[PDB]
């Protein structure tokens, strides 16, 4: 699920770099410098997001265990109530007939 995100981030970074490079010669020195440092900050944000992703990549086990344990209880939870509902339904309708 991270491959599409990585490809999209690479495409967005390439487009931003191309736009900044095209705008720098037309704009003045100060505006070009501001655009370049803003693009550097955005790329740094992308880099730290990628770093967080690759740090969590090996930390995907315990969260999965917690999620499947919670689902098991939740899946089970539907089952106990359903059994109770069936008993309740039988008393209300089957007994009357």
């Amino acid at each position: 699920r991270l491959s599409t995100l990585i490809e999209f981030l690479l495409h967005r970074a390439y487009s931003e770099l191309m736009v900044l490079t095209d705008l720098l010669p037309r704009k003045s020195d100060v505006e070009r410098k501001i655009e370049i440092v803003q693009f550097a900050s955005r790329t740094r944000q992308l880099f730290v997001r990628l770093l967080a992703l690759v740090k969590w990549a090996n930390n995907a086990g315990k969260v999965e265990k917690c999620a499947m344990i919670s689902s098991f209880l939740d899946q089970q939870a539907i089952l106990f109530v359903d059994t109770a509902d069936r008993l309740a339904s039988l008393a209300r309708d089957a007994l009357v007939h």
């Binding site: 315990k62 265990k65 344990i69 098991f72 209880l73």
Partner: peptide, 19 residues
């Protein structure tokens, strides 16, 4: 069952004791 300690059976104990 659900009455066992599912985490210690699923070898996830030391990560929790870290966390």
């Amino acid at each position: 069952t659900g009455s066992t300690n599912l985490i210690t059976h699923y070898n996830l104990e030391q990560a929790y004791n870290k966390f």
